[PDB]
Design a protein around this ligand. Structure first.
Ligand SMILES: *[C]C1=C([C])[C]=C2C(=[C]1)N([C][C]([O])[C]([O])[C]([O])[C]OP([O])(=O)OP([O])(=O)O[C][C]1O[C](N3[C]=NC4=C3N=[C]N=C4[N])[C]([O])[C]1[O])C1=NC(=O)[N]C(=O)C1=N2[C]/[C]=[C]/N1[C][C][C]([C][C]C2=[C][C]=C([C]([C])[C])[C]=[C]2)[C][C]1
Ligand SMILES: *[C]C1=C([C])[C]=C2C(=[C]1)N([C][C]([O])[C]([O])[C]([O])[C]OP([O])(=O)OP([O])(=O)O[C][C]1O[C](N3[C]=NC4=C3N=[C]N=C4[N])[C]([O])[C]1[O])C1=NC(=O)[N]C(=O)C1=N2[C]/[C]=[C]/N1[C][C][C]([C][C]C2=[C][C]=C([C]([C])[C])[C]=[C]2)[C][C]1
Ligand SMILES: CCCCCCCCCCCC[N+](C)(C)CCCS(=O)(=O)O
Ligand SMILES: CCCCCCCCCCCC[N+](C)(C)CCCS(=O)(=O)O
Lengths: 499, 494
């Protein structure tokens, strides 16, 4: 019935918010739609897999908040396997390699690839993390799809094909669906292209021992009965002195403030009294989440390692169901598995098939890519289509179509009376990730501690001590990388020499 | 409690649907979220204006369904004033003209303008009304914004800006926000460029005496207590034998079938059990409505008519709050008024101002465009900002961003078990309009009649005889208009 703060949503962001508010001495309630906590994280446990992350999974250096929270809850990380060679599969052939980026040999193509990555990071520096709409050319770039930007930037089909896969794989959406400004922002607020695509020294370095669902579960364990499962919030009323929050099972909750810790667009499921302001009213109809199926195929052994393949595959091609894989063998070396993502329009297309038809298509793909018949001998298959989740909307996160971030962006985390906004979408560092869920959750919580006069204004946004378990190597460039010309730059050098 | 069919939404679409079902002998309830019916139509009455449509208002030839329904409810139309000259205001000067399309004098610009309009209708001829995702070039056109298309097509800044205005005005969104495929479909399913922009012999030819809101009020009058106001639906359950529909005020309604007659995205305000199929679950997050403020300034007299202006203004440029006006004077010659739309980003921007501040800006603009100090002396002002409506989400209608129509368009009017889908968005002729809303409510109702055994499959989609009161004249083109080259075509001859 009565408390200080009601948190709507029991994902990482909600549970991080509640935990901070509870640790500070307030009475909180977490209202959670599903029969479980975790949200876009979910750890399945059976005898065939022991445990497996069907949602959010990877962490890495610079993600210091999620690592501190996980460690405070008694969790440990382990390194994803990147000992052996990565594979770049393009035009029906596999090309093994080492280091984060697939190499390229053709000099024209080398210049175009170098310039693509460099330009992403170049445009990124123009874009404030905390206010993307303030970039000097915010409008010009927001009025563009990533597709249009790649049509202008990539002078080779090789670079354009790889850039297309990068977008799809990073934001589970087509290049023609997303704003260039938004995408550039998203990449920059993760710390740049190298940080986001890397396993070693980047976003995919590590997983938690026993799965990421433990984060939410263990916070629930601290909060006891304060967490209420199967409580979909339908109604928020701010007309009176106390905020009244109504659930679908006809319960009433009464509070001083509310944290909305749900994907922006899932805000549409709540009826508001009084109505939301114009700008938030339209914003939450303009921000969908991407489309992805996560698939894990299990095998007797990690046979690929024996061929000096770490199990990372970067798979270009329309025929290919999966575009990216990682090794998902346990750190012990057992329950050998390949993890892969089916992305964007391929999630739409291939969801029409049965579980068994998807397994077959993956095994056949893996067989060709790894040059192994063993890939046709799976011992188990687990999967989750995030597109069919009423209380997620999709995965990994919310993307912004063209025109939306400059017009509506500033209201994402603008409080509405005594409603405050968390969720990873509201973060300024690794928004989209579990890291961003923790940042947004703790920031939202502290916004309320300020409103209550319990902390000063400068303690709302709090920096995070670098992890001592997972320290960050800095991102370096070479002289050549920095100064080699673009393709158009070389053409200008050719027109000038011959004059 | 118990009935044959629950309709969610008491806009024109819901009401048209409920009326049809009720007339055929079924017990229908209409659940409406607001304290009124009409939805994106709303007629305000006061002594100062008498009545004024603050939402959907205009009807015209080929919109035979809204005309027939309205005629049956005892409503009549009158012609929007277009006797005198239109005005195109470009680079701070007023150019009077007659006929639907503002003229062009420079030969190059001329070729370019001619090519733009012709090209929208050519592209449209390859888009099926009932299935735009089947256009031969569906994917290629769906993956561009209308900004990209206009950048390719328009060789002059003049044509690019008039085409940008055209997009902004028709679908209340920016060229860069919308799929080219969707926009081309939209125009095509209204009968082409000429039909959609024309007052005489087009979509803006007529209004309803007493206001459009009478359509819904009078259907509510016919259904009596069967319409439940302030009943926002929150929960639809199809697990059991009958469908259970729950409202925010806690009431339980039980039925054999449901019609959802709300804008697709407002589907998100409903919790479903079992959950929605994947494709609809994502669709309803990907389909916003435009942004618009409708503004009506009242004057002592229709003074513009003294200067041989009809009150139609087409106003180029960023600085103008309003890009388009019509005469909103009553047919009797009184309650003189000018109606203007503040579109898209200008709606987001100018909404921060006060009502008085908007009125001042509009009056100063009209003074300049009409070239008259009489515009500075308004006697009254009414406006509505549809962006702020929880239960509309905007106006006029839902637009499709790049990528969505081809990927999710199929799911729009596909039944989900015992839920059938109406609303103007699901129509195939004048979707987006009150005509659309009628077509879709009556279709959705007739789908339920078929599921129930009462009518054959071939009677779900019913043609409509032409209104005798509002006949359509044919759309024609000249020989020059059809065969004059584009700018690039003139250059491939040189
Ligand atoms: C789904 C997913 C997946 C599948 C995956 C992933 C993910 C996801 N992610 C994301 C995460 O998970 C997120 O972020 C989080 O979790 C979020 O959180 P929050 O914020 O908390 O939210 P949520 O969870 O959702 O929660 C919510 C809640 O609430 C509720 N509700 C609703 N409604 C309602 C409610 N309640 C009450 N009432 C109402 N009404 C619900 O239920 C819930 O509970 C992630 N993240 C991280 O961190 N990690 C990971 O891993 C993840 N994942 C992902 C991945 C990604 N990626 C990255 C990138 C990569 C790629 C790279 C590359 C590129 C390129 C290249 C070239 C070739 C060179 C390479 C590489 C991939 C991966
Ligand atoms: C808003 C608006 C405005 C402002 C305006 C307009 C409009 C609108 N429109 C549209 C209409 O209105 C529509 O379509 C209709 O109405 C719709 O219907 P429906 O479908 O039925 O829907 P609604 O109404 O929305 O309803 C729904 C209902 O539901 C409810 N709910 C929700 N949720 C819920 C519920 N319930 C229960 N539960 C739940 N959950 C609600 O409440 C409601 O009630 C229109 N239309 C027509 O027809 N007309 C008109 O007028 C209109 N308007 C408009 C405008 C138009 N435009 C056209 C075009 C023009 C332009 C021309 C031109 C262009 C260019 C040129 C150059 C320069 C050359 C020229 C010219 C403008 C105008
Ligand atoms: C003749 C030039 C070929 C176009 C090459 N692409 C990369 C397609 C476009 C360059 C765009 S931009 O010119 O740099 O704006
Ligand atoms: C010159 N513009 C109009 C910029 C493009 C010409 C169109 S085209 O793409 O070159 O056919």
């Amino acid at each position: 019935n009565k408390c200080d703060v009601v948190v709507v949503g029991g994902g990482i962001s909600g549970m991080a918010a509640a935990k901070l508010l509870h640790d500070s001495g307030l009475n909180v309630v977490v209202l959670e739609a599903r029969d479980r906590v975790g949200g876009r994280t979910y750890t399945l446990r059976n005898q065939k897999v022991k445990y497996v992350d069907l949602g959010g999974s990877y962490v890495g250096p610079t993600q210091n908040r999620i690592l501190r929270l996980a460690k405070e809850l008694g969790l440990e990380t382990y390194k994803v396997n990147e000992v052996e060679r990565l594979i770049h599969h393009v035009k029906g052939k596999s090309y093994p390699f080492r280091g984060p980026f697939p190499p390229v040999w053709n000099p024209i193509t080398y210049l175009d690839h170098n310039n693509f990555w460099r330009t992403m990071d170049d445009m990124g520096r123009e874009i404030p993390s905390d206010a993307p709409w303030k970039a000097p050319l915010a409008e010009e770039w927001d009025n563009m799809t990533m597709k249009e930007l790649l049509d202008k930037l990539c002078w080779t089909e090789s670079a354009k094909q790889l850039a297309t896969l990068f977008v799809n794989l990073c934001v589970t959406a087509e290049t023609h669906e997303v704003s260039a400004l938004w995408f550039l922002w998203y990449v920059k607020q993760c710390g740049g292209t190298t940080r986001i695509i890397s396993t070693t020294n980047g976003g995919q370095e590590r997983k938690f021992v026993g799965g990421s669902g433990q984060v939410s579960e263990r916070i629930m364990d601290l909060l006891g009965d304060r967490v209420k499962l199967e409580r979909p919030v339908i109604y928020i009323d701010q007309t009176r002195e106390n905020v009244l929050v109504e659930t679908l099972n006809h319960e009433m909750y009464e509070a001083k403030y509310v944290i909305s810790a749900i994907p922006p667009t899932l805000g549409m499921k709540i009826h508001f009294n009084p109505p939301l302001p114009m700008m938030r009213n339209q914003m939450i109809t303009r921000v969908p989440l991407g489309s992805v199926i996560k698939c894990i195929v299990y095998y007797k052994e990690p046979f690929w390692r024996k061929k000096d393949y770490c199990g990372t595959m970067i798979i270009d091609g329309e025929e290919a169901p999966v575009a990216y894989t990682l090794d998902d063998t346990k750190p012990e070396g057992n329950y050998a598995a390949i993890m892969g993502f089916i992305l964007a329009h391929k999630a739409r297309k291939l969801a029409r098939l049965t579980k068994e038809e998807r397994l077959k298509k993956l095994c056949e793909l893996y067989a060709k890519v790894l040059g192994s018949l063993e890939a046709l001998e799976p011992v188990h298959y687990e999967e989750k289509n995030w597109c069919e989740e009423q209380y997620s909307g999709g995965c990994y996160t919310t993307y912004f179509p063209p025109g939306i971030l400059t017009q509506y962006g500033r209201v994402l985390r603008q409080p509405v009376d005594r409603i405050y906004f968390a969720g990873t979408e509201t973060a300024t560092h690794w928004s989209g990730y579990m890291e961003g869920a923790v940042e947004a959750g703790e920031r939202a919580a502290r916004e309320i501690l300020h409103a209550m006069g319990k902390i000063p204004e400068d303690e709302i946004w709090q920096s995070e001590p670098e992890s001592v378990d997972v320290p960050a190597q800095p991102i370096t460039t070479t002289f050549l990388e920095r100064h080699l010309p673009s393709v158009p730059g070389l053409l200008r050098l050719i027109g000038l020499t011959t004059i």
